[PDB]
Amino acid sequence: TTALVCDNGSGLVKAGFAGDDAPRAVFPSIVGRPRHQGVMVGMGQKDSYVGDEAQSKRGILTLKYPIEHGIITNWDDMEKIWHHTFYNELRVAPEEHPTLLTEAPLNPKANREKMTQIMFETFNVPAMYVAIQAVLSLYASGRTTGIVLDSGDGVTHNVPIYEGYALPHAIMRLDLAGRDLTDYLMKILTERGYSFVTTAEREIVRDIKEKLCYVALDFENEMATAASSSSLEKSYELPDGQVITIGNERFRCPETLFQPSFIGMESAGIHETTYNSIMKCDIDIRKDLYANNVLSGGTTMYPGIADRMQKEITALAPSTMKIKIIAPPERKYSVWIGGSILASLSTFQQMWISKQEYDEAGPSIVHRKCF
Amino acid sequence: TTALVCDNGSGLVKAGFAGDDAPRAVFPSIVGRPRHQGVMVGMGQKDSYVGDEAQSKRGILTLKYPIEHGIITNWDDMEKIWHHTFYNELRVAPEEHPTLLTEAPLNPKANREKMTQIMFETFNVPAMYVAIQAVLSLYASGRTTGIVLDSGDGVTHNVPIYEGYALPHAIMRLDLAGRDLTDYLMKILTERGYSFVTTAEREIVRDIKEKLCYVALDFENEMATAASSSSLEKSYELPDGQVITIGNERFRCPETLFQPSFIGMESAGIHETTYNSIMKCDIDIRKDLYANNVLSGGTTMYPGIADRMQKEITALAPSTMKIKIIAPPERKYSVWIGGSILASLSTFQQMWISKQEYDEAGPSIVHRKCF
Amino acid sequence: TTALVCDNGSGLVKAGFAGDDAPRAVFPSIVGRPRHQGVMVGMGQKDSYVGDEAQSKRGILTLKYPIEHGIITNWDDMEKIWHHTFYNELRVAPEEHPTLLTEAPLNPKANREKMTQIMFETFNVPAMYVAIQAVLSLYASGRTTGIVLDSGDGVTHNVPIYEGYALPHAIMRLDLAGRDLTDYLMKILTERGYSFVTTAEREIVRDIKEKLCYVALDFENEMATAASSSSLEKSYELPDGQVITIGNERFRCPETLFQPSFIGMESAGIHETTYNSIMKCDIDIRKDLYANNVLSGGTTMYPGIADRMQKEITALAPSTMKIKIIAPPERKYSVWIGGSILASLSTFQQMWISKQEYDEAGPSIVHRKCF
Amino acid sequence: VPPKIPDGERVDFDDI
Ligand SMILES: Nc1ncnc2c1ncn2[C@@H]1O[C@H](COP(=O)(O)OP(=O)(O)O)[C@@H](O)[C@H]1O
Ligand SMILES: Nc1ncnc2c1ncn2[C@@H]1O[C@H](COP(=O)(O)OP(=O)(O)O)[C@@H](O)[C@H]1O
Ligand SMILES: Nc1ncnc2c1ncn2[C@@H]1O[C@H](COP(=O)(O)OP(=O)(O)O)[C@@H](O)[C@H]1O
Ligand SMILES: [Mg+2]
Ligand SMILES: [Mg+2]
Ligand SMILES: [Mg+2]
C-alpha cells in the first residue's frame, strides 16, 4: 500500500500520500473553542473547530496553537488535530497506512516517545517512522551534501550534512522563527496607532506580514530612505475596511532574523549561526558546505532574503570561497516533498518501526536502531 | 608473461608492470573507515575507502596508515590495500603474474614470512620474490658500486655496496623519515597559532611540507636572516581559505634530518650516519664509496639537500678524497625503476620463489637460498 | 620585597603574595558590558563590570571570557582584568612588586611576548617571569619526577618530568577541558526539556556540572543502571525555583574526558594520552612515571576520577608495573601553591627578567635564556 | 544505539 507522509510542523500541517509533488491538504494547526454564550438553539454548534474551519469562524473563537516551539505542549489538542487530518482532510483510515512524521532536531525525548505511543495506540497505524526535518529538505533539493537552514514557523535549525554523513556536533538550533516575527510586527504596528490584541487578530497581523514585509538588502540605507521619501508606504485593507499604511515597519519586522537583539534575544542572526555551524565542521568539507548552502521552510520566503544572506556570509567567509545560496521556488513544501521522496524509496522500506517491534520494546524503541 | 613490480613502501604504494619507465598507479596507502553516523539512505556508503579515494572523502574519515616504520602493523588493512592495488588500479588478476615486493633492511622476519604467505595463499600468485629496497635504487642509477641513502617516508637506511658485493655489517638503519618530519612540522606550526590535530589535517601539513620546506645550506645564517628580514615568509592557502604564512619554519622542519636531537632522537643526522657507514667498510673501497654516494627515496627531494649533504661530508671526510652526490631527477621512483630493471633481466628469471617450492618448505622458504 | 604570584588561567584568576598557602583573591575572569538601555539617571552605571562583580549582575550583562583556549583573544579585556586584579583585589601597586605569570605549554609566541610587553609598559612592574603551568603543579606535590596531567578549564596538557629534566618531545596538549564539558552538558540537558541559551545561563549550567556530575567507574554498567532504577536522579533548584532533575546526564557529561568522540573530537581520552605520553619517554624512566602520576587543575575534581583513570591505565599498562595516581585534596590551587613555592626560593631569585634587560633586547627576551 | 542505515545503491540528482 501507500504511505502517509504527514508533517506536523508548527503553524501549518502538511499531509499527503507518498509519491506526489505537493501535499494534498494544507491547513493551519489551530483548535479554537467558542468563548461567548450562544443563544440560538439547534444551530448545531460544536465544541471545538479545528483546522481550516476555525479560520473562518475566528471572530468568536479563541484559537490556540497546540505546538509552541517544535515541542508539543497540549497533547489532547494535537491528538484532535491528527484525527481531523486523517479522517476529514484525507479520508483514509490509519489502520491500513504507514506514517512518516517529522520532528525538529534537539527536541525533548518525551515528545517523540509520546508521539509514537499515540500513533500506535490510538490511531493504530501499521508502522511509523520519525525523521529529522532538515534531512528531508536536503532530499528535495536532489543534493547529497550541503548545510540546510530550515527556518520554519516554530524553530529555526541549521543541520550541516556531508556526503550523507550528518555532523551531530554542528547542529545549531535557534528558537526565533515566524511566530516571534508575527509578535514583533504586532508590537511595532502600535507605533502608528493600530492595536491588535485578540488571538484572532494575530492572524490578521500574520497576513500583513506575509503580504507586505520584505528583507532589506542594506538596513541603514533603507532606514534612511524610508525616513525621507514615501515610496515605501504600502497600504492594506483590513477584514472590515479602514485601510492601514505600513511605513518602515515593512523591512523592520523580518530584520529581526539577522539581529535577534530586537526582540531581546541574545544570540546572533541567521546570517552568523550558519557561518558558526560551518566553522565547527572539519577543515576539508568547508568549501562544499559554502557552495551548497540550502534554504528551506516557510519563513525563508521573504522577498530579498537570498541576497541579504549571501551578502552577509560573503562578508564573513574568506574571500576565495564561492558562496552560493540554493533557494528553490517550492521552498514552503520542501520538507514534505523530501518526505515523499524518502517514503517512496525501496531501500528505505525496511526501516519502518513495525508494530510487533513496538510491542516488544515499548515506546522507547524510537531512540534505538530504528531512529 | 609479464611480472608485477609492486613496491609497498610506507606512504605511497607504487606499482606497475615490469619493463616500463614509471609506475602505472601511485596512490597513498591509507584505509579510512567513516566515523560519523550517516543519515542519507541508499547513498551507497561503503565501510572502508582505500587508496586515492580516501584522500577525497578525508573530511569525514579517520585515515590510518597500515605500515608504521617499514614493518606492517595491521595485516587486514595491508591485505585490503594489496587487493585494491591488484584489482582496481591495475585490473590484472594475480593468478597469472609474478610479483616482486620490496622490503627495508633489518626488518623483522615475521613480517616477510607473513607477506609471502599472504601472496601465496590469498592472492595465489605464481611466484614472488622479495628484494631489499636499496639494491634496486642502485640498479636504477646504472652503477654497480656506491653507498645508497634511501630516505623513504617510513625509515631511512644506508646500504653500502661494492662491485656487487653487499657489506652486511655496514648497514645503518635509522627510523627518522618523512612521517616524523610531518609530525615535527605540525608541532612547530603551533608557534604561530595554526593548530592541526585531526588525522585528516596531517595530510594538509604534509602538503605544506612538500610545497614550501627546503633544506638550508647553513643553518645558523638562515636562522639569523629569517629573524631580521622578511624575504623568506611564503604564504599558502588552506583547503578553505585563510592563507597562512610560514616563516623560519620552512628550513627548520627538514633540518631535523641533520640534527635528530630536535625530535628527541639521540642518533646522528643523515650526514654523519653515511660517514660512519663508510668508515665501517674496508680501507681500500672507501674512495669509490666516497665518489659514488647515491641519494634515493622521496624525502631526499627537498630543494637544496644535495649541497648541504655534500658540504657536511666534505667537512667530515679527509681533504684529498673527492665527494660526489648522485641525485637523479627521478629520485622518488628510483626504487621502482630499479625493480623494473631487475625483473626484466634474463639472468634473474630463475630466482623467483616458485609455488611448488613454497608448498614443500612452508613460508620459511624466503630466508633460504631464494632470498 | 614580596613577589606577586598571579596565575591567569582561563575561568578563574588566582592571585596572591608569594609564600602563603592559598591565593588571596579568586574570582571568575569575565568582562561583561551591559546590553539593555537603562532608564534610571544617576544610578552610577559603569560601562564594564569585571571579575566577581559581573557574577552578581549577570542578569543584564553579556559575559565574555577574554581567554579562549590558553591563548588570549581579546587583549583589551585581559588588560582590564589584570588592572582589576592588581588594584582592587590585592590593592598593591605593581610598581613595587615582581610578578610570576603562568602559561600553558605549546602556546603561540605572540601571546607570551604581548603579555610581557603589557606587564612592562602598562603596569610597569620591576621584573616578571613566565612559567609553564605543569612544573608548578609538580612543585606543589613536593616531588621531583612524575607526569602531571593538568586538566584546567581551557586546555588539558600532560607534561612528563624526570629528575628535574623535562622531556620536551613528550608533551601532549589536548584542547578538551572544562568549558567544552559545560557546553556539552548544556547541550544534553535539552533532552529533558531544559533549554539554556544565554551566555548568563552558561554559568548556571556550570554550577550544575560542579555540584552534581561525577565520573562513572564503569560506563556501560552505569548506563544500564540509570535506565532501570531511579536511584541516581538528583534534583537541583534553579536561581528562581522550578527544580530540575538530572538523570543519566550526571555521568555522561564528564565521560567526554575519556571518550572525546562525544563532542566530535577525534583524539583519545585523557586516559590514553597519558599512556602515550609515557610511552614516548625513554625505556628506563617509565616505571617512575607510572608510579608518580600526578593530577592537577580544576576539572580533575570530579568525584570518582582518580579511580577510573587508575583502572584505565592499569588496563593499558603492563601488568607488572604499579600504577599510582596522586590526587591531593588541594587540587584546584595546586598550580598556584607551586608558584608560591617557586617564587619563595632563594636559588630562583636571579632568574627574573629584569627591566633593564627588557629595555636592551625588547619583548623577545622571554624566549631567550630567561625562559 | 544510533540508527545505522542499511545497504542501498542509489539515486541522486535525478528525481529532482
Ligand atoms: N509567502 C510568505 N512570505 C512570508 N512569510 C511566510 C510566507 N508563507 C509563510 N510564511 C511564514 O511561515 C510560516 C509557515 O511556515 P511553515 O514552513 O509552514 O512552518 P512549519 O515548518 O511548521 O510547516 C507562517 O507562519 C508565516 O509566518
Ligand atoms: N617533492 C617533495 N618534497 C619534499 N618531500 C616530499 C616530496 N615528495 C614526497 N615527499 C615526502 O616523501 C614521502 C614519500 O616518500 P616515498 O619515497 O613515497 O616513501 P616510500 O619509500 O614508502 O615509497 C612523503 O610522505 C613526503 O613526506
Ligand atoms: N568542584 C568541582 N567539580 C567539578 N568541576 C569543577 C569543580 N571546580 C571547578 N571545576 C571546573 O574547573 C574549572 C576551573 O578550573 P581552573 O583550574 O580554575 O582553570 P584554570 O587552570 O584556568 O585556573 C571550572 O570552569 C569548572 O568547570
Ligand atoms: Mg518545517
Ligand atoms: Mg622507498
Ligand atoms: Mg590551570
Side-chain angles (χ1 to χ4, degrees), chain B residues 166-213:
Chain B
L167 275 30
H169 64 264
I171 300 179
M172 306 290 298
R173 165 177 172 180
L174 176 56
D175 290 328
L176 207 169
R179 190 97 57 81
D180 296 20
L181 299 194
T182 294
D183 290 354
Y184 183 55
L185 172 64
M186 175 193 304
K187 176 159 189 157
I188 58 174
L189 282 194
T190 201
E191 290 174 358
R192 314 187 72 97
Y194 320 122
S195 77
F196 302 104
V197 281
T198 324
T199 174
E201 288 168 336
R202 166 115 44 85
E203 317 299 329
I204 301 178
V205 177
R206 183 180 59 85
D207 187 7
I208 293 176
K209 169 180 70 90
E210 289 184 351
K211 296 181 182 295
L212 264 55
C213 295

Side-chain angles (χ1 to χ4, degrees), chain C residues 7 9-10 14 102 133 150-153 155 157 296-298 332 335:
Chain C
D7 170 75
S10 170
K14 295 158 289 179
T102 63
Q133 284 199 0
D150 180 87
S151 172
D153 176 32
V155 56
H157 58 263
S296 140
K332 304 195 56 178
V335 168

Side-chain angles (χ1 to χ4, degrees), chain A residues 7-14 26 29 65 67 133 150-155 157 177-179 181-182 206-207 209-213 296-303 331-333 335:
Chain A
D7 169 75
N8 299 315
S10 170
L12 278 83
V13 169
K14 295 158 289 179
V26 173
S29 85
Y65 294 72
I67 293 194
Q133 284 199 0
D150 180 87
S151 172
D153 176 32
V155 56
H157 58 263
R179 190 97 57 81
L181 299 194
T182 294
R206 183 180 59 85
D207 188 7
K209 169 180 70 90
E210 289 184 351
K211 296 181 182 295
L212 264 55
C213 295
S296 140
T299 328
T300 52
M301 287 275 299
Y302 289 141
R331 246 170 306 188
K332 304 195 56 178
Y333 315 109
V335 168

Side-chain angles (χ1 to χ4, degrees), chain A residues 106 108-109 168-169 171 264 266, chain C residues 35 62 187 190-191 198-199 264:
Chain A
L106 299 191
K109 316 292 275 300
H169 64 264
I171 300 179
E266 167 123 23
Chain C
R35 76 185 189 196
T62 155
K187 176 159 189 157
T190 201
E191 290 174 358
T198 324
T199 174

